[PDB]
Design a protein around this ligand. Sequence first.
Ligand SMILES: NCC[C@@H](O)c1cccc(OCC2CCCCC2)c1
Ligand SMILES: NCC[C@@H](O)c1cccc(OCC2CCCCC2)c1
Ligand SMILES: CCCCCCCCCCCCCCCC(=O)O
Ligand SMILES: CCCCCCCCCCCCCCCC(=O)O
Ligand SMILES: [Fe+2]
Ligand SMILES: [Fe+2]
Lengths: 510, 510
Amino acid sequence: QVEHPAGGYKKLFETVEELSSPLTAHVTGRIPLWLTGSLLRCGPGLFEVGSEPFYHLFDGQALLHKFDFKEGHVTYHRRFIRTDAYVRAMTEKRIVITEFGTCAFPDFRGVEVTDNALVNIYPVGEDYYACTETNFITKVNPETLETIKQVDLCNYVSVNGATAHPHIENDGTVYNIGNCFGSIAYNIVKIPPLQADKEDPISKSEIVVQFPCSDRFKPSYVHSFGLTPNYIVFVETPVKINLFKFLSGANYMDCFESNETMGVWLHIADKKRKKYINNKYRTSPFNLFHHINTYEDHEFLIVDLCCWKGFEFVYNYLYLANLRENWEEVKKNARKAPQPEVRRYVLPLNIDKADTGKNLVTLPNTTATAILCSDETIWLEPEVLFSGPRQAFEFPQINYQKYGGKPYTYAYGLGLNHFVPDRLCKLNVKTKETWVWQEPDSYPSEPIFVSHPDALEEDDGVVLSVVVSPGAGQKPAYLLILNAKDLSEVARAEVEINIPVTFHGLFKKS
Amino acid sequence: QVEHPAGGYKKLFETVEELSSPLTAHVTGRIPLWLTGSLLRCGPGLFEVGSEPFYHLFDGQALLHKFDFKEGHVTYHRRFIRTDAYVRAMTEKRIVITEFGTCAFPDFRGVEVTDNALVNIYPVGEDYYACTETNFITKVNPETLETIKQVDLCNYVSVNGATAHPHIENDGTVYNIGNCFGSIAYNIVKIPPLQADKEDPISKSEIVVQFPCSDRFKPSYVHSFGLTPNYIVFVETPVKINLFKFLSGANYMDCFESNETMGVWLHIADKKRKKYINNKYRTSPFNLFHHINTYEDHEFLIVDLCCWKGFEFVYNYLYLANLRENWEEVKKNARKAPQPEVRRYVLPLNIDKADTGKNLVTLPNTTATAILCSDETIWLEPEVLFSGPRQAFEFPQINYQKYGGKPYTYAYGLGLNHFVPDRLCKLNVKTKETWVWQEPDSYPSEPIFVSHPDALEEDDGVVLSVVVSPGAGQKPAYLLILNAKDLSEVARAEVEINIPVTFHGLFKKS
Ligand SMILES: NCC[C@@H](O)c1cccc(OCC2CCCCC2)c1
Ligand SMILES: NCC[C@@H](O)c1cccc(OCC2CCCCC2)c1
Ligand SMILES: CCCCCCCCCCCCCCCC(=O)O
Ligand SMILES: CCCCCCCCCCCCCCCC(=O)O
Ligand SMILES: [Fe+2]
Ligand SMILES: [Fe+2]
């Protein structure tokens, strides 16, 4: 459908320099007065060290970005995060730490796991942490973008790592998941809010509940998980980490393999009684990176997911050399890739043996099914919410503070065209209506939703996305502000420098 | 969504009497001049013999119906088909032959298989045959509706039975499928067109190709199949016929069971070289009654299906006592039923071992996938074309003569609301747009498409459906003629008597 023959998307993967202090952006249209605060995003900003290239999308050195709405103007600022990976590279003028898809070559100390925090940033107590998916997170300063310290979660709780998508309750309580040793297992970690003593909430971390693993020695790759007021949902996919190959030229990609026969196993745990529920939910194979939202509806959990159909690891398609190709080749490279699809799964909670052989999903407004089998597995089929050929609705966001974990209607997403980000999408998950914002030669980022302080409806607010527009007669980038009702444009804050790709972030209200 | 508290649909399952000669219908609107010919449909018309009830939807005695467009008026006529089942019942004043869900009680001869031809009618040579799904078909007179003879396909070819959905090529060549003995197997039967000798084409029947069965002694129930210019497609579902229980109080329903672990196996055969292709296509469990259309697109077959998600046999929900309940109870009874969904499957024909682990479906306009596994199974996921909660798009029809087996855009269907027929639907299978015709307290039949003789586009024509409208100030039934472009009404031909449910039929042009 939409084509990008000029190859502008290449700019998303080009090195930039940090700034000494904030630039003032030039605003077009009108920024609502109520929008005061800061958009903070992370992504790779350095794609080679001298003449040594990084190879994968997830290898570039973490760059922390900020758009600040204050005092009737908008500023843009970015700084590299002073991780061990980045600081040692700058010192030694080479790739020192092995990244996801780039092995470092040398030139007793133990394996040096990357702390390249390029993926997301989130609050813990009164602090902010940039993260990747390892055991290392980096405390950063949200005002100045200075790097404060490295933290090793292994010093506090028993997990080997943790996702870049913790869930955060309204009181500031933080939940995350990581694999551990139990036999392998997956641990839900909880960090309480800041208390009166003002001591670091991370030092009060604990394990809430443990999920079993389908394979004794091979945990699945986990990228996110679901949380409602009463339940925790974990989706175990057939993308496996081969721990044998892990602990014996290698990078992180080399240790992944796909299990061809397991499909997807879905798991739930009682959040409040802190216990695993032994219901054997089963379905077809897909990769999963992002949960959209999860909620409870009578005796059922509604589990909305951004899926990639198949068991081949989608990250195989995300080496930089492939994302930098010309457009005809980008399309051709995605021909045999897993197909993206938004799916709603419905998990019955009150399972009666007398209904063996039947569909347990008795809700009136879904076509999802769940069949109780005689072996006691529950075989799920989804209701499809969005499906376009090689057109993914990904990097999903909702009105999180008020609708996270609850019944809801709207999701916002980044549209990927053969893996190239080229549109912003709003989905009504009940009616499947969509709204799209797109301009030619414009490559946007994850949309972040900000609620109007006096909102009455779920979509009373704006959506923020950072857009790269390399075209000949163009400011090379801008912050885009859309009305969430219909994705119509409200304002842009343009800047005169490039901005590389970013993955995730937050809006910090002020 | 739409509700039927008055329970008018009960009239669909009420006995009627045959007519001595045609009634003249009263026409409202205007019937196109080009529409000349006859609509012939079959269904049950006698739901009890004296005080002995029939229990299942498929048990009532075959009634042959005709709407005749001739000479600037429309007539309606119906006659019971004088099958052995019907004639013996009328003679003995009781249920003599066991029907699908009604065991006959007595009052050396061999098992007496029903020849109650209530399901469909189709041409063979210059003849027309009413059928069910047994070995017995009944030659009928399309002008007078007289019954001519019983035919036993077992006298001509080696099958135990045959579906009520043969495919008919433009030259009159007839293809069908039935299970047989090979070990059980499934045989494609071919009947040639009428030749110069004028001898009965059925006496020239032969077996073209044989499909293997997933279970040595248990064939799956088969209701229809797919045909393109070069391929035959057969879908083997987990609804099994237990031949053990078959050959040992019993009716046909009692012999069915669901296989919980096989899912669906899809099979193709080279039509012209008459050989089975050994590609092991596999997917999730569903019931299938009706193929919509099948065609070839580069090295792929496109297989569009009306599916019911799950392995429980959907016919369990179609006993007359359940279909006659009040509306709140009808809905409640369908709560745990399989969910209807229209699905497009895509079958790769050129399978390369070097693509093991990847999605082979490289077509640009689909989200269907097919993954080649190391065990050499090919795991399919569908593109969903239509999905509504307990709202089935069923009894599908297309512009068959010109688009059957070929690339196409439009399907027409009967909308079932918790198994109650209450709307007519047109689907664009490429865009997924739909059009609906619905009126309150009106229960339509399968829509049959008739092409304009000077058609330029696929949907240049009309759709015919027989509608029952029992409401207080109403002619109790009518033939509905809709414009196929948008399902807007063109004319009705009303009659002053009831018409019970009909399943399938044809338009015979004249
Ligand atoms: N968000 C994309 C993946 C990226 O954050 C990344 C970059 C570097 C290392 C890494 O490791 C994930 C590992 C978790 C522990 C087990 C091996 C895989 C993951
Ligand atoms: N169209 C609905 C089913 C109906 O035609 C019907 C009515 C009566 C008998 C029957 O038999 C199907 C059998 C095929 C041979 C093996 C057993 C099932 C099927
Ligand atoms: C942000 C656009 C990047 C261009 C490549 C987009 C392809 C993403 C495919 C889905 C995988 C999502 C994993 C990345 C998000 C994360 O690291 O948390
Ligand atoms: C025609 C409306 C009948 C009312 C019940 C409709 C439920 C049909 C469920 C799908 C099964 C289709 C099988 C019947 C068609 C046939 O016998 O060929
Ligand atoms: Fe992510
Ligand atoms: Fe049928």
